[PDB]
Write a protein that binds this ligand. Structure first.
Ligand SMILES: O=C(O)c1ccc(NC(=O)c2cccc(CC3CCCCC3)n2)c(Nc2ccc(F)cc2)c1
Length: 190
């Protein structure tokens, strides 16, 4: 049961032809988000690996905490972390927690999908946000994602997040269902 945390990049209509990164203040009026959004890989819909636990505007940007819950994904990633020379090649030698290091290295980016800013000028009809993706490429404003086994340790890793902000983030995290979160749809290509 893994947690992920970090500052996100906000991307409108990602993957499509007219993709556009957004200024955080273009969506901060629609934060915070406390209902769970799917966490996918690289904006691919059949790769749900978990669920967000909170998206909060904070001095320095928009912070995401999430839970990685897919058994198929966690088993695949942990197996690779323990047996794959390829997975371990770009990580420091002999790390204590290989799974956390491999995710921190290979999926450093958190990317929040939003509707186009034209819809954001005047009263959106429906949900502003669609998902958060763990991404191999495309990190700009976001921090490098931190993966851990407890949410407190994860949020702590960001000095750009004050004691108060960290208390607020953690408040909504503990109130979130953990075993009640629906099962994500990721299937192992192995
Ligand atoms: O169609 C194919 O055969 C196929 C081919 C290649 C694939 N991936 C990459 O090239 C790739 C590149 C960068 C990062 C990642 C994420 C992964 C890194 C290692 C630890 C777990 C996270 N995957 C995938 N996608 C993939 C999904 C999860 C996973 F654990 C491994 C691969 C599928």
């Amino acid at each position: 049961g893994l947690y992920v945390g970090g500052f996100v990049d906000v991307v409108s209509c990602p993957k499509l032809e007219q993709e556009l990164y957004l200024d955080p203040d273009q969506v901060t009026d629609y934060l915070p988000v406390t209902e769970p959004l799917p966490i996918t890989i690289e904006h691919l819909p059949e790769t749900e690996v978990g669920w967000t636990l909170g998206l909060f505007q904070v001095s320095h940007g928009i912070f995401c905490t999430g839970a990685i819950t897919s058994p198929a994904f966690l088993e695949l990633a942990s197996r690779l972390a323990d047996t794959s020379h390829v997975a371990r090649a770009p990580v420091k030698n002999l790390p204590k927690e290989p799974l956390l290091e491999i995710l921190h290295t290979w999926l450093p980016g958190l990317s929040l999908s939003s509707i186009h800013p034209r819809e954001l000028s005047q009263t959106p009809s429906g949900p502003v946000f669609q998902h958060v993706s763990l991404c191999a490429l495309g990190r700009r404003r976001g921090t490098v994602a931190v993966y851990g086994h407890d949410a407190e340790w994860v949020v702590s890793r960001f000095s750009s997040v004050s004691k108060s902000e960290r208390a607020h983030i953690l408040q909504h995290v503990s109130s979130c269902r953990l075993e009640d979160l629906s099962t994500p749809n990721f299937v192992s290509p192995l």
